[PDB]
Amino acid sequence: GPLGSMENFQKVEKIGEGTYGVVYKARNKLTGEVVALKKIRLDVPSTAIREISLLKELNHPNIVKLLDVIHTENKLYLVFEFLHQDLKKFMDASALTGIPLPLIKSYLFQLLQGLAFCHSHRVLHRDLKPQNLLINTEGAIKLADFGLARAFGVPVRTYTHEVVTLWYRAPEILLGCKYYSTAVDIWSLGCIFAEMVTRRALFPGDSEIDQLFRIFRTLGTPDEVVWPGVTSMPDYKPSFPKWARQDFSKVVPPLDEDGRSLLSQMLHYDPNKRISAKAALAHPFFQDVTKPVPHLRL
Ligand SMILES: CCS(=O)(=O)N1CCC(NC(=O)c2n[nH]cc2NC(=O)c2c(F)ccc(C3CCN(C(=O)CC(=O)OC)CC3)c2F)CC1
């Protein structure tokens, strides 16, 4: 890659990292804009260039705006609108009190709007976690750091938290589905919904098999009765232990029956019965949705 394209930006602090990139807060010297940068070290793929170009076109109020794509030296920089906090820090700050139900409902509604938008363009997020959800003082929440169909970049050696990505993975992914669907995003968001309500991760596995078994112990070991074709999936084993399902009233107390009903549809095993983002927006849980503002300490 050529030189000098990033001289317009002044990095002000390192604010995060992930499998394939380091995140900075930065300022444009020309415009004064404050921005987030994702720095990807390269060893390029044109298919990935086109995927990122399409994401730059996918603009919605509940998707973090991708402002620019800049290649320089052995690096790819993605330039994003800046948001001051992510949902993980907000739940951590709210751990003693919990997030008020109206704000949980607003955040879930907004994220379903962003996903219904993406999914209508046949775009998957693939990597939805609390740290991918950015919030501002006005009460908005936004989807960030979409995963691509094929990754690229030199893995960041200083990043040690990839185990946390298991927690939000859909069972069809864990069972070896190669061409999974927008339903994986609904699963992840369901896990995040339960986490907002209970102030505890729903399925905090630490290996692919522990992740599957944690799902099975709560929702029951899946079989042909509830998921036709599951026993033929590439990583399905007849030797899986057979656990009975638990009740959702144990799983996310004290959530009301509207919320529990919606959560149960977001956590259906079969990606063909799992509720879509659009159908979820019509769920009776949202009959009284409002837009509260969070108390953010920046
Ligand atoms: C105390 C902190 S904070 O809450 O004060 N606050 C400080 C401000 C900060 N703002 C921004 O970052 C930001 N603003 N506009 C756009 C932004 N970022 C991104 O687009 C972006 C990105 F380009 C790449 C990766 C990530 C995330 C994805 C999820 N992650 C992982 O998968 C790795 C991991 O550990 O998984 C468990 C964590 C990193 C991004 F968000 C949020 C957190």
Q: Are 223 and 231 in contact (CB under 8 A)?
A: yes
**Which ligand 1 atom is at minimum distance from the Cα of 144?**
20
**Crossing angle of helices 101-120 and 183-198, rounded to 10°:** 170
Q: Are 89 and 25 in contact (CB under 8 A)?
A: no
Radius of gyration of the chain (CA): 20
15 is in an annotated binding site: yes
Q: Which residues are catalytic?
A: 127
Alpha-carbon gap, residue 128 to 165, rounded angstroms: 9
Going by the DSSP 8-state scheme, the letter that residue 191 receives in this structure is H
Amino acid residing at 131: Q
**Which ligand 1 atom is at minimum distance from the Cα of 81?**
15
Alpha-carbon gap, residue 147 to 145, rounded angstroms: 6
Question: Which residues form ligand 1's pocket by a CB distance below 6 Å?
Answer: 15-16, 18, 21, 23, 36, 38, 64, 78, 80-86, 89, 129, 131-132, 134, 144-145, 161, 164
Q: Are 116 and 286 in contact (CB under 8 A)?
A: no
Q: Cα 68 to chain center, whole Å? A: 22
**Crossing angle of helices 257-266 and 183-198, rounded to 10°:** 140
Q: Domain-by-domain residue ranges, the chain?
A: 6-84, 85-292
Exposure on the CB side of residue 240, measured as CA atoms within 13 A: 24
What CATH superfamily classification does 6-84 receive?
Phosphorylase Kinase; domain 1 (3.30.200.20)
Q: Identical fold at 6-84 and 85-292? A: no
**Which ligand 1 atom is at minimum distance from the Cα of 37?**
23
**Across the strands, what pairs with 39?**
22, 77
Task: Tell me the CA–centroid distance for residue 130 and ligand 1, in Å.
Answer: 9
For residue 156, give every residue at least 6 positions away whose Cβ sits within 8 Å of its Cβ, in sequence order, or none.
17, 18, 19, 20, 21, 22, 41
What ranges in 20-164 are assigned the alpha helix state H? Answer: 46-57, 87-93, 101-120
User: How do strand 9-17 and strand 75-81 relate by DSSP bridges?
Assistant: unpaired
| Residue with CA nearest ligand 1 atom 17 | 36
Alpha-carbon gap, residue 12 to 27, rounded angstroms: 7
Alpha-carbon gap, residue 12 to 59, rounded angstroms: 26
> What resolution in angstroms does the PDB record give?
1.8
CATH of 85-292, one of 1.10.1200.10, 3.40.50.300, 2.60.40.10, 1.10.510.10: 1.10.510.10
Q: Are 35 and 9 in contact (CB under 8 A)?
A: yes
How far is the CA of 81 from the CAs of 77, 227, 258, 271, in angstroms?
13, 41, 35, 33
Name the residue of 13, 86, 128, 162 whose CB sits within 8 Å of the most ligand 1 atoms, as the mutation to test its pocket.
86
* Structural biology method used: X-ray
Alpha-carbon gap, residue 177 to 233, rounded angstroms: 7
CB atoms within 10 A of CB 64: 20
Q: Are 19 and 131 in contact (CB under 8 A)?
A: no
38 is in an annotated binding site: yes
Structure tokens at 51: 């995927």
The CA angle 275-164-69, to the nearest 5 degrees, is 80
